[PDB]
């Protein structure tokens, strides 16, 4: 299963996804943590002003390219409530970030959308390693499945 | 179906790729065209200052989300010298842009890189529609294969 320390940062990601929903946005949150265990950057979706590319994982990738050396990026971890879409997985790989840990997979998300009769996203729900074959990926976290099911249903399952 | 008009925009993308090469960057160029035929935005790779996500197709997607209505985006066309990487294909789909026309495929680039012993991209060379299933895609343009091979050789040959 997932480490206890990893699960604590995933719970922070879920809290960020809840912040996003409560601000009229989509429930996706992500945290960048360095190899010392220091949180460097936290973000959530910001698509409500009209830019559907406003994903936290992408913001993290550009922040890392700006602020961190290649060595430091490679040793950092990105935690996310939901597995990176292909945009974000590719951006992560381009900048040379390290491990990804997700609470819920894109397989879970896509399966729930179809359960609810909801439209699929306009991007295929490709696993990270289809897009970015070298990235170390862990998840999902069983303890957080129900919570994320309920967040996603609130936004996308009406 | 690559019309004479399409080839003209592709040639402009080649010119933008060469601008990038001559500025110390990588030879990738892209143009956003309104359905009325007006060029809206032009760009090329800007990765030399350390951000490997600085691709023109991505810049086009974010510019389009900032400046164009959804209806205008849907009717716009993106031309590119090189087929979108997954990052850029996904961004295009997220913002709801229209048709993509490319001069050279990402399979062609990948094959040329391998022949040079150049470092493969850390992203898979997925065709656009693997990432963005609903996007209308045309390309490659045989007339521009050699020209692009030569530009790529200038940057990545060894
Ligand atoms: N951050 C984010 N926002 C949305 N709306 N969807 C996604 C997503 C993640 C993986 C696959 C497909 C969509 N990611
Ligand atoms: N714009 C661009 N820049 C680079 N360095 N590589 C690409 C690329 C396109 C398709 C697949 C893989 C890389 N695109
Ligand atoms: Zn994303
Ligand atoms: Zn790209």
Automatic annotation (TrEMBL), chains A, B:
Binding site for Zn(2+): 55, 57, 85, 88
The protein's name in its UniProt record: Cytidine/deoxycytidylate deaminase, zinc-binding region
GO terms of molecular function: catalytic activity; metal ion binding
InterPro entries documented for this protein: CMP_dCMP_dom, Cytidine_deaminase-like
UniProt KW keywords: Metal-binding, Zinc
Classification via PANTHER family: CYTOSINE DEAMINASE FAMILY MEMBER, TRNA(ADENINE(34)) DEAMINASE, CHLOROPLASTIC
The organism of origin for this protein: Mycolicibacterium smegmatis (strain ATCC 700084 / mc(2)155) (Mycobacterium smegmatis)
Pfam family, one: dCMP_cyt_deam_1
Domain of life, source organism: Bacteria
Domain CMP/dCMP-type deaminase: 4-113
